[PDB]
Design a binder for these strands. Structure first.
Ligand code: 3AT
Ligand code: MG
Ligand code: ZN
Ligand code: ZN
Lengths: 348, 103, 197, 199, 50, 49, 65, 343, 148
RNA sequence: GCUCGCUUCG
């Protein structure tokens, strides 16, 4: 007999955004019923769907055949499509509020006592992670005070239990890498992980984002299968928000206000640029101006004025970046690459 | 049906236990976490919320030696109850002497 | 009479359209020294990419105004300057930058970074999840082509467009494509003569 | 004036995106309608719907672009070697010299399971092995390390430490990754190409 | 809106829904949350076996 | 252009095919001079939170 | 339309302090000193009373009656 | 030295220019070498104390010394949500001709607090909409607005033209059920403020309704919250690294709260000192003055929490704190009984 | 004794690239007995240091002086006579890199050990004879005690 | 119910 049962937990269900650019715009997931009225999914899968949670309406299809259900779960599984077929780069990766949280967590300033570290570790012990041992790592500093660094807490995500065969290893350069330290950068931007343990460096978009290769989740996918990468991503998505909320991350009007030295430098640069532009205008209008090759005199003047304005812009941006102090929320989000960049900071 | 115990695996190891507590929130979870973390025989204590929609919390206790991890739970509960009784008595006494000295 | 829930669209008078992601209780909300808990918690990450400093200036001016009982002006190419609202904040005993000492409601411990609190004029939009939620059973079909209808008022089903078919082809799921486009949409049994065709 | 210019630039960007949406939609439709017929057969030859062969082998080599770890290369031998050294550090086995490394590599590569592998990948493996052997030789010549294994400072053996177990693990891992990165027959390669060009 | 493009290559189907999305990090990457109201409407035919 | 709020003083006797009203509308604290010119503060379409 | 009874953020009873506030507006008190005299220390109640528009009488002017 | 830094980390919470440091509670066994932070009931009972500094109607302020942030937050959250009270839930309407919507009217009536003692009632069982004498209360509200028979010719103000045009909550009449009239004396069951404006009427319009109120907690809905603002803050302790005198000392009086820093003329010159650090709100305005940044050290005491509880008037706040502690004790006892039943 | 290395160092610089981190500093130190350079990340908030400070540093395989290498798990609550009683600043890390010196093209005798104490970097560079016993993927204890 | 137009939504 045929029974038209309700949609229950475990049913393979297609989930799609109607504007489709690549094949990853539609994926087969596992349905879990919730009392609310919206389609909820992990934000790490937002990059394939290209969603932004500002009113997006998405479609949800239910196959009516066991063969179709199995084909959807196998071929269009979320764990089996972590990389795009265009260039092999992983699309399902960490996103905003996950890159910044992991970056602030893996900073060298982080030092957690036993209670806070235990809480942050237990924040992920839900679902299938309820049947594994915690494996609290040994503390780094113990004689003056027993403190657990944030890097060990982040590495716990990679290898939660003792019986977990995950042994992650990675050696790459970060966004703010100097180029000469070679794992001894003053900014500590050289990512080095041995045996699923973050030995050096701070996490950012270059290592946790969906930009290109050398991603830790990509390494886990290519070395230990899809399930381990999915579990690591779930642990990250369950750990980073908890620490980000318990620590506090806010932006204010004082985070974007200019300094006195910045104002003086901007004034001097504007004066110099305006003087040089007036000199160029006077040279072109009255007299002979050096004509650049491949263009006329007017185009030469346009190029020179654009060059001077760009000089003013970049010098003001460098002055603002130098005068800015650390822990600045725009600068912090620009360093980790979660959102924004130095150009937006200089403009604002 | 409110508080249920769960062993770490099928081996039924008493060192690592998980207590699932129903119709609770961060209040009692954090209070019991603080009251049992001071127990020297507790290696790992940690409470978490499964999902904000449902009202349940999961606490996990891992001891040092061969403690069943249920005795520290009862110890922390009794210590929290004693602390609550003491603070209640102290607050009542303070309010009473304030009312006395005010008049 | 409808109450805001998960899925309702909200605006903040600065193009920062958003959807209610979670409804936390009052005790879970962080609190300041005065005991004020925020109604709306917005993501800071939306600021750097969009450079909405005007929102911060509006928040500061509104905080200064509700402190001194005034209505500040956000007039284009003018309005109240930042120095005036900063002086109004420092006069009333609050921080001159809006950031205030806040203790976490969950753990009961103070946050390492100050939180930017202030009154913001949020406006609710007509786009509701209750009106946009749609589910389609077998339902009715069209007379000309025996396929589900189009609109929700007509109780229609979703349309697997050409690009969805392209994605299903790229995945190689032949059986799923067959079930979607033939079995579940316009399946029929005709009688064909093997002699004349 | 600055606000007006900024609004002009914003409207220019908006109209550019508005035109781009429709243009790329039409281009994607055309590309998919043209390329949807190709498929990877079981004989490693990409053929059309009518049976005509488009390529005797996809991409000249037959590797999956989705499983491409390197920059248009199947494996990054340096990262794979580092991972093999880190995951399986054998402390009870002595280090290998250049000659011993070359000998064990030539002995392992001549097995039956490596015959079905492509010749280009084997040549790349040989090149990487020769490079790492030259590096080990340069290190041992700089620090005077003797291949007999009787040097007094044993920490000198930790500079470039390699054991035959790690060599076998590295070679087997490379072979398995190359075998699992090939084009699985039956894949709609044409539709994937159309989508990866249109997006 | 012709037969080939509107009724043959791409056509409307039943047993489908459309809803606004909201974030939820407590779910796995291969899982998606479905409302109870839509789940009661979209049905799956299961065959009775042993 | 899609903001929800009061329409006018006769919004109760008015019968339209679709109308959205706010329970407790509040005038903005940071109001532009254009708002005072168009008398938007008499008919707000949002709340200060 | 009408003054809400409870404050949105804190929850202090504010509906009973509306008409008296209007009296303070009928008197010579300004906005700030009136809000201070009403007992609203935190700025949330000040925003609730100050930013509220009294639209109930405008609607009653259109009531059937 | 190192010991001073350890003590500052384990006892004080320092507020920097850009961020706060030493915010996590760390006094736990094994975290510190030279400190035995193991639990001791005797030391806790010795060090802990409660001192009320202000107590009036619907307002309480008291300092607790020796308690931790976890128990303080637990008490605050129990007071905010887990303290049960009485509030309007069911609204039966008979010919509501008011302009105010029926649902909006019911929502406004639900937010009106009730002076009834919640401890004398019980939770209504699942269903049972009829209600019983034990677990419900009835409030009748019947207001018929009509024109004033005697008024001036103009009568521009609505007060002179119409009567009962503003339906205040004082029109609510408690209707006893069963023996509630004998148990509760007259005047006890009534609206708290008695001046809340429910709606405004016009002649011809009438508002007739009955309100069924049942016991409930603030977690289910905010209308059951007894406290308007129940919060706690760490006690500040401003310290001066170096003696500040002269006119700059006056700047201190202008940098911090007016009532914390006091200037005195010990030798004819003004020198500033901390008078009452309680009044300071930590506006962090001292960081603006460049010279005065390195002369002060703003800090918060970790084990000293000033609780401020402003209630809605349902019951005095001391009884509210007592009931919160009793609810926490009841949760602990329920979990202990469950654990004993398991074993 | 599981002491792998022991030497007295003097600090020559505190932050050559500026005050990057509030709690951690990158101290550069030179030894007196040998020409052993040390680039070490230290926590100044709990263990403050100065430019002219001189301290004895010991890298040991185990924290127990009796030779018991049983370090499966560390219990801070356990009280017993250990090596950390004789020192003030004890860290726990793993020697994650051994790199030969590349400045000397020929006849090089200098090596460097990179150890990661939970992300805190320590490069100990010098003669390979002093670095005897250092192996990759080996967990060690650092013990630093300031001298007069 | 068919068609067309406007309008919004991402
Ligand atoms: N005509 C369209 N065709 C396809 N997709 C569309 C169309 N209009 C909107 N969308 C959807 O909305 C998204 C467009 O957002 P995007 O342009 O990236 O940000 P935005 O609208 O510029 O926001 P900001 O102005 O940057 O704040 C991407 C796409 O899936
Ligand atoms: Mg969108
Ligand atoms: Zn025929
Ligand atoms: Zn308020």
């Amino acid at each position: 007999d045929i029974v038209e049962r309700h949609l229950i937990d475990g049913d393979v269900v297609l989930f799609n955004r109607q504007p489709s650019l690549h094949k990853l715009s539609i994926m087969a997931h596992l349905a879990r019923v919730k009392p609310h009225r919206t389609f909820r999914f992990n934000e790490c899968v937002c990059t394939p769907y290209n969603a932004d949670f500002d009113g997006d309406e998405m479609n949800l299809h239910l196959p009516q055949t066991e063969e179709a259900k199995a084909e959807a779960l196998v071929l269009m599984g979320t764990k089996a499509n972590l990389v795009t077929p265009r260039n092999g780069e992983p699309l399902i990766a960490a996103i905003q509020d996950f890159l910044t949280g992991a970056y602030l967590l893996t900073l060298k300033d982080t030092f957690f006592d036993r209670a806070k570290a235990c809480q942050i570790i237990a924040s992920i012990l839900v679902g299938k992670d309820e049947k594994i041992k915690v494996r609290l790592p040994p503390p780094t500093i113990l004689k003056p005070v027993t403190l657990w660094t944030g890097k060990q807490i982040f590495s716990v995500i990679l290898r939660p239990s003792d019986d977990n065969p995950v042994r992650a290893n990675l050696r790459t350069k970060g966004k703010q890498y100097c180029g000469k330290g070679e794992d001894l950068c003053a900014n500590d931007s050289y990512v080095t992980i041995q045996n699923s343990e973050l030995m050096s460096g701070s996490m950012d978009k270059g290592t946790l984002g969906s930009g290109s290769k050398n991603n830790i989740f990509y390494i886990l996918l290519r070395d230990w299968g899809q399930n381990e990468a999915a579990d690591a991503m779930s642990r990250l998505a369950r750990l980073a928000p908890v620490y980000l909320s318990n620590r506090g991350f806010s932006i204010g009007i004082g985070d974007v206000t200019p300094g006195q030295g910045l104002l003086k430098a901007k004034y001097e640069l504007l004066n110099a640029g305006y003087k040089k532009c007036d000199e160029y205008i006077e040279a072109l209008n009255t007299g002979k101006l050096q004509q650049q090759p491949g263009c006329t005199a007017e185009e030469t003047l346009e190029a020179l004025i654009l060059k001077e304005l760009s000089v003013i812009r970049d010098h003001a941006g460098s002055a603002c970046l130098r005068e800015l102090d650390k822990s600045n929320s725009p600068l912090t989000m620009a360093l980790c690459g979660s959102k924004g960049s130095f150009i937006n900071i200089s403009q604002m | 049906k409110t508080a249920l115990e769960m062993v770490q695996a099928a081996g039924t190891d008493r060192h690592c236990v998980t207590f699932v507590l129903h119709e609770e929130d961060h209040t009692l979870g954090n209070s019991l976490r603080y009251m049992i973390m001071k127990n020297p025989e507790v290696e790992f204590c940690g409470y978490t919320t499964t999902h904000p929609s449902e009202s349940k919390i999961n606490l996990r206790i891992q001891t040092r030696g061969t403690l069943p991890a249920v005795e520290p739970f009862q110890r922390g509960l009794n210590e929290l109850m004693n602390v609550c009784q003491h603070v209640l008595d102290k607050f009542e006494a303070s309010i009473k002497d304030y009312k006395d000295q005010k008049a | 009479t409808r109450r805001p829930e998960i899925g309702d669209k909200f605006s903040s008078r600065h193009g920062q359209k958003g959807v209610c992601g979670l409804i936390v209780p009052q005790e879970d909300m962080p609190f300041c020294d005065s005991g004020i808990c925020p109604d709306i918690i917005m993501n800071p990450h939306g600021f750097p990419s969009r450079m909405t400093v005007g929102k911060l200036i509006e928040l500061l001016a509104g905080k200064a105004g509700v402190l001194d009982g005034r209505f500040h002006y956000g007039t284009a190419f003018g309005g109240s300057k930042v120095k005036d609202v900063c002086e109004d904040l420092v006069r009333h005993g609050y921080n001159y930058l809006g950031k205030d000492y806040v203790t976490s409601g969950i753990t009961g411990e103070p946050l390492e970074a100050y939180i930017y609190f202030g009154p913001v004029y949020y406006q609710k939009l007509k786009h509701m999840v209750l009106d946009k939620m749609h589910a389609r059973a077998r339902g009715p079909r069209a007379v000309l082509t025996r396929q589900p209808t189009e609109g929700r008022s007509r109780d229609g089903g979703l349309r697997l467009g050409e690009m969805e078919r392209d994605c299903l082809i790229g995945y190689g799921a032949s059986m799923l494509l067959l079930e979607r486009l033939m079995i579940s949409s316009d399946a029929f049994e005709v009688d064909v003569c093997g002699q004349c065709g | 004036t600055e606000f007006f210019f900024h609004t002009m630039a914003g409207r220019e960007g908006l109209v550019d995106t508005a035109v781009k949406t429709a243009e790329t939609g039409y281009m994607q439709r055309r590309l998919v309608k043209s390329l949807e017929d190709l498929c990877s057969q079981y004989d490693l030859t990409v053929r059309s719907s009518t049976g005509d062969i488009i390529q005797f082998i996809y991409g000249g080599d037959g590797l999956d672009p989705a499983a491409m770890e390197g920059k248009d290369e199947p494996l990054e031998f340096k990262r794979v070697l580092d991972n093999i050294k880190a995951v399986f550090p054998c402390p009870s086995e002595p280090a290998l010299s250049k000659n011993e490394l070359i000998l064990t590599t030539e002995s392992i590569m001549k097995k039956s399971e490596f015959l079905c592998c492509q010749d280009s990948f084997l040549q790349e493996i040989k090149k990487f092995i020769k490079g790492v052997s030259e590096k080990i030789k340069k290190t041992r010549d700089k620090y005077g390390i003797n291949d007999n294994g009787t040097t007094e400072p044993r920490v000198l053996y930790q500079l470039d430490r390699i054991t035959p177990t790690q060599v076998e693990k590295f070679l087997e891992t490379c072979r398995d990754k190359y075998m699992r990165a090939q084009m699985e027959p039956g894949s709609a390669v044409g539709a994937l190409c159309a989508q990866s060009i249109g997006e | 809106q012709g037969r080939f493009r509107g009724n043959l290559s791409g056509k409307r189907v039943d047993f489908s829904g459309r809803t606004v999305i909201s974030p939820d990090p407590n779910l796995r990457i291969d899982e998606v949350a479905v409302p109870v109201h839509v789940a009661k409407i979209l049905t799956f035919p299961e065959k009775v076996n042993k | 252009k899609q903001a929800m709020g009061t329409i006018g003083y006769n919004q109760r006797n008015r019968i339209d095919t679709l109308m959205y009203l706010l329970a407790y509308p509040q005038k903005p604290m940071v109001k532009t001079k254009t708002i005072e010119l168009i008398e938007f503060e008499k008919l707000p379409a949002g709340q200060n939170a | 339309m009408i003054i809400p009874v409870r404050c949105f953020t804190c929850g202090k009873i504010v509906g009973n302090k509306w008409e008296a506030y209007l009296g303070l507006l009928q008197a010579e008190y300004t906005e700030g000193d009136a809000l201070d005299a009403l007992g609203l220390k935190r700025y949330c109640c000040r925003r609730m009373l100050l930013a509220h528009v009294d639209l109930i009488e405008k609607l009653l002017n259109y009531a059937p009656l | 030295a190192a010991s001073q830094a350890v003590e500052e980390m384990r006892s004080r919470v320092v507020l920097g220019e850009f961020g706060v440091r030493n915010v996590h509670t760390t006094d736990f066994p094994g975290n510190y070498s030279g400190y035995d932070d193991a639990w001791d009931q005797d030391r806790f009972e010795k060090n802990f104390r409660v001192d009320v500094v202000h107590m009036d109607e619907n307002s309480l302020e008291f300092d607790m010394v020796g308690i931790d942030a976890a128990i303080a937050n637990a008490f605050r959250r129990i007071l905010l949500a887990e303290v049960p009270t009485m509030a309007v839930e069911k609204v039966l309407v008979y010919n509501n001709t008011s302009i105010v919507q029926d649902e909006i009217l019911a929502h406004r009536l639900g937010l009106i607090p009730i002076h009834a003692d919640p401890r004398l009632f019980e939770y209504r069982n699942q269903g049972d909409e009829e209600g019983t004498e034990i677990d419900t209360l009835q409030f009748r509200l019947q207001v018929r607005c009509t024109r004033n028979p005697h008024a001036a010719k103009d009568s521009s103000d609505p007060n002179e033209l119409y009567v009962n045009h503003k339906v205040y909550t004082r029109h609510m009449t408690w209707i006893p059920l069963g023996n509630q009239a004998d148990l509760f004396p007259e005047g006890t069951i009534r609206p708290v403020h008695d001046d809340i404006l429910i709606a405004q009427l016009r002649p011809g319009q009438e508002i007739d309704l009955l309100m069924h109120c049942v016991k409930g907690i603030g977690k289910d809905h905010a209308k059951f919250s007894p406290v308007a603002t129940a919060s706690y803050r760490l006690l500040p302790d401003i310290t001066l690294l170096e003696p500040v005198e002269g006119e700059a000392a006056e700047e201190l009086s202008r940098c911090f709260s007016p009532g914390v820093i006091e200037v005195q003329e010990v030798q004819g010159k003004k020198v500033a000192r901390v008078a009452n650090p309680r009044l300071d709100t930590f506006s962090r305005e001292i960081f603006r003055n460049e010279k005065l940044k390195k002369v002060v050290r703003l800090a918060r005491v970790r084990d000293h929490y000033i609780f401020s509880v402003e209630s809605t008037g349902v019951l005095p706040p001391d009884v509210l704190v007592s009931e919160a502690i009793k609810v926490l004790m009841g949760k602990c006892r329920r979990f202990l009984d469950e654990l004993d039943a398991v074993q | 004794a599981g002491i792998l290395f022991e030497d007295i160092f003097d600090v020559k610089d505190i932050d050559p690239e500026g005050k990057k981190f509030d709690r951690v500093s990158r101290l550069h130190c030179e030894s007196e007995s040998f020409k052993m350079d040390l680039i070490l990340d230290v926590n100044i908030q709990i263990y403050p240091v100065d430019l002219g400070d001189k301290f004895r540093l010991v890298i040991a395989s185990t924290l127990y002086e009796d030779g018991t290498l049983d370090d499966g798990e560390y219990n801070p609550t356990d009280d017993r006579p250990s090596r950390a009683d004789q020192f003030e600043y004890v860290m726990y890390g793993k020697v994650y890199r051994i790199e030969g010196d590349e400045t000397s093209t020929e006849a090089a005798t200098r090596l460097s050990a990179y150890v990661s104490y939970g992300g805190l970097l320590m490069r100990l560079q010098g003669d390979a004879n002093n670095l005897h016993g250092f192996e990759v993927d080996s967990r060690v204890y650092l013990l630093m005690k300031k001298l007069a």
